[PDB]
Amino acid sequence: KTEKEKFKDSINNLVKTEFTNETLDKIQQTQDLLKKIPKDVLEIYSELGGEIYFTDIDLVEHKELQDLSEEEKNSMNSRGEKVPFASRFVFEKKRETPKLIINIKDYAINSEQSKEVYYEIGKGISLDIISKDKSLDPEFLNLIKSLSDDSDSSDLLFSQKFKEKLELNNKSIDINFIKENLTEFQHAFSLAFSYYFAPDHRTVLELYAPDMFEYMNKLEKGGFEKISESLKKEGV
């Protein structure tokens, strides 16, 4: 490794020698975004019946398939509670079948925008990993039990209202509390999904909540494939 080679790969990504088009590079960056979640997650989303679309620049519903139709009726879909639909770039249409609309942006350069995509993907496939038939698949119930009050630094996975309600009820194992706040359970799973698969900060989940990391690691090392082939064999 001479000085010339060290300088030559010091500027390996600063010189874009083949650019030639503006919206042809956003497409390559969106493809490189989506190609690093594993194959089993995408195949679970297809066996559920899901769609993913790389639309052009039309933020509010100029998109003809997310057009003036069935839509969100809420106050919170980000990691906070904004939903200012003029300034969104990912939405999921899941009424009769799942369908994900991903606007194309510069995802290799922005890493905060590149996390809402994984958050909505994990929101989409939440109810088929968090449950088996109509339940909470009680490994996940033991997980939320182990993260409820046993760690003050596992409030990165819960909302504010879910935290105060789980504080007030304080013994939530019953099926009364489970079906009253299932959206918060999906929120916790999807937020751990986005923290696990964003490349820059996975170790924040490994540090501040070390047992959710084990759940996600076993998922990635074969639970996704298991639930995929289960839904496949049920599909025939």
Partner 1 sequence: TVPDRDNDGIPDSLEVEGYTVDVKNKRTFLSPWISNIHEKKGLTKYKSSPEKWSTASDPYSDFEKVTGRIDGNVSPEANHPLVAAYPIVHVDMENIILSKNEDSQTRTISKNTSTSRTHTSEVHGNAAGFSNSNSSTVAIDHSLSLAGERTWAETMGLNTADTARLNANIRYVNTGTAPIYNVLPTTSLVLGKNQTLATIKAKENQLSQILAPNNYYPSKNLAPIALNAQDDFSSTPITMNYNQFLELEKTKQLRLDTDQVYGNIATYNFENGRVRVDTGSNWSEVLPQIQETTARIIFNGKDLNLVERRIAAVNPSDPLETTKPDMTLKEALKIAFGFNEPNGNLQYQGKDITEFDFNFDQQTSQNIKNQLAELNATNIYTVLDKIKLNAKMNILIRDKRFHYDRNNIAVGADESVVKEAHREVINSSTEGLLLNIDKDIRKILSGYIVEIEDTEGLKEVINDRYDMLNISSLRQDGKTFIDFKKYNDKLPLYISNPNYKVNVYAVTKENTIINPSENGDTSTNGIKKILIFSKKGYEIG
The pattern of x and - marking residues 29 through 68 that bind partner 1 according to CB under 8 A reads ----------------------------------------
Contact residue for partner 1 among 14, 68, 86, 236 (CB under 8 A): 14
Q: Does 200 bind partner 1 (CB under 8 A)?
A: yes
The two structure tokens encoding residue 103 = 């606007």
The rounded distance, in Å, linking the Cα atoms of 2 and 5 is 5
In the complex, the smallest distance separating the C-beta of residue 18 from partner 1, rounded to whole angstroms, is 8
**Listed ranges 106-114, 130-138, 139-147, 213-221: which one lies at the site for partner 1 (CB under 8 A):** 106-114
Using alpha carbons only, what angle is made at residue 114 by residues 161 and 30, rounded to the nearest 5 degrees?
A: 145
The rounded distance, in Å, linking the Cα atoms of 134 and 226 is 18
Contact residue for partner 1 among 199, 233, 234, 236 (CB under 8 A): 199
Q: Compare residues 135 and 153 and give the one whose CB is closer to partner 1.
A: 153
Count how many Cα atoms sit within 13 Å of the Cα of residue 29 in the half-sphere of its side chain. Answer: 18
Closest Cα to residue 26, out of 110, 106, 117, 103?
A: 106
Q: CA 227, 141, 97, 38 torsion: positive or negative?
A: negative
Q: Compare residues 29 and 131 and give the one whose CB is closer to partner 1.
A: 29
Q: Compare residues 13 and 176 and give the one whose CB is closer to partner 1.
A: 13
Q: CA 224, 229, 234, 236 torsion: positive or negative?
A: positive
Q: Compare residues 115 and 123 and give the one whose CB is closer to partner 1.
A: 115
The rounded distance, in Å, linking the Cα atoms of 106 and 80 is 22
Contact residue for partner 1 among 5, 67, 112, 150 (CB under 8 A): 112
Residues of the shown chain interacting with partner 1 in the complex, contacts defined by CB under 8 A: 4, 6-8, 10-11, 13-17, 19-22, 106, 109-112, 153, 155-156, 199-201, 203-204, 207-208
